[PDB]
Amino acid sequence: SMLGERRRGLTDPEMAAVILKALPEAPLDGNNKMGYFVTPRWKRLTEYEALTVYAQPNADWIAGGLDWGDWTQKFHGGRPSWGNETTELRTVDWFKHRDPLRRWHAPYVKDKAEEWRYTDRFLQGYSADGQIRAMNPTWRDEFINRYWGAFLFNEYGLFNAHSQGAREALSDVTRVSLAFWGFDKIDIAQMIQLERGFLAKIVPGFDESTAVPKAEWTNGEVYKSARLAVEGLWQEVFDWNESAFSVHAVYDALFGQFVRREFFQRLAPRFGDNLTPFFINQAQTYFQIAKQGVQDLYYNCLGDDPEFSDYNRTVMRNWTGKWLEPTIAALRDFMGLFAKLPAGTTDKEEITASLYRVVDDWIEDYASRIDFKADRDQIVKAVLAGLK
């Protein structure tokens, strides 16, 4: 019918009259601010904080929890749903973390969605404009298809390294940040495949199958140590903080940044490739967004914890030393790719300087925050040994 059968209390005269009559003259409490008891990180409580903090039902025996008592149902054996035992790091309050970009679900999918629709417009403008014509064939078929393509597996592995953290994170704010750090990694892996799929449509003979990139990743030499590092970070680490910390403040900060920015972002343009840098721009944007969250949790909150600062830094230094070696190895093997480039593409000085840029940024943005005594020339020298 035009009016329908279901009557609604907001618009149905009879029902609304009943509702209005039972209403108080004014609110039964003037404090209309949900989350008013949450300590604001900034001047005033944000929507991000109100909708997120304390969503996790932790009891007080897990630093910062407001509830009481044991969990209602635990694992066979007794393991608690969530517990202090799942990570070496300690803190006065697990709810202190704040994503500097204040991303809750809505803003997060909004931004990614904008990037998706624009990406689609870009590709249609790129293909319609015929810009593929000026791209060097060898760079396209060999370096983008095989080597950039193989890197998708690196990002995919880092993505998966977040699975256990999504389950064990000790607070809502950390869980949401971790979830988003991981989701951005799978996105990048999918954008690498997206590009390969795009190229397969505008370039006759280009095979989008992942067989070649995957064989490179699983059996090649250039990415051997990288893969060995990812396999360890993902499946040999059972501590959710060691995982996130080592991935973002060690491995991806050195190896990832070198591959994405100092190799592909830096050289693609020299071969008429504006396609790959479009996607790397997204990856770097994501990297920098995650860095802020990674720094707030590990440095601002844990590394500078009023009671466990010294302990946490000792532990993170331990982790940095543990994963720095496998990371140098990954970089060392990757050096092998430079010998594959057409003569005159780049030289040892350029490579070394770019290596120093990544190491210096790492020391500034991460190592120094926990007093890890990194020796930049020793690190670079160790990596350069891989130059064939």
């Binding site: 009481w68 066979h76 054996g77 393991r79 035992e85 070496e88 060691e242 302990y311 000792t314 030393g321």
Partner: protein
């Protein structure tokens, strides 16, 4: 002072813990605490309302002391007692796989948690143990889960039936 989140019992233990300034002493107190106040096999339920919280405060002290006393290799691979974590993990898993029944298996898993829960054993090894021990324990427990009548199960568990009511 008898609050939920703050009371005399909790304050008393905070003071006790403040005096644990040696790793061996602190670690031993933590294990003893776990034997006395955790799991259904605890020596007593006197601290039932505060043990979870006190245990965490005790863990903090052991952790802090272990990080200061151990070199980097030992912090990653040894227990607070100086044992080799891998050896303990493998030895416990071996016993679990040799468990004849679900009753033997539960004692192995539970006891493992009481003795090695972080910061005694490094988290990496501990959760790897949870993974393996929990699997066997469930496999043994969930087989023919409903075959034993409650009347007989109560006897196997060894509870004292205090009161039974039925319409």
């Amino acid at each position: 002072k008898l609050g939920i989140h703050s009371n005399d019992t909790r304050d008393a233990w905070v003071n006790k813990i403040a005096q644990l300034n040696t790793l061996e002493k602190a670690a031993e107190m933590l294990k003893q605490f776990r034997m006395d106040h955790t799991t259904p096999f605890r020596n007593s339920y006197e601290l039932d309302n505060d043990y979870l919280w006190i245990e965490a405060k005790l863990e903090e002290k052991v952790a802090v002391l272990k990080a200061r006393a151990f070199n980097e290799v030992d912090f990653r691979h040894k227990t607070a007692f100086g044992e080799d974590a891998k050896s303990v993990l493998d030895g416990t898993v071996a016993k679990m796989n040799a468990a004849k029944d679900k009753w033997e298996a539960e004692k192995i898993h539970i006891g493992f948690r009481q003795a090695y829960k972080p910061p005694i054993m490094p988290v990496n090894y501990f959760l790897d143990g949870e993974r393996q021990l929990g699997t066997r324990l469930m496999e043994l427990r969930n087989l023919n889960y409903y075959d034993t009548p409650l009347e007989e199960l109560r006897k196997q568990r060894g509870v004292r039936v205090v009161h039974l009511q039925s319409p």
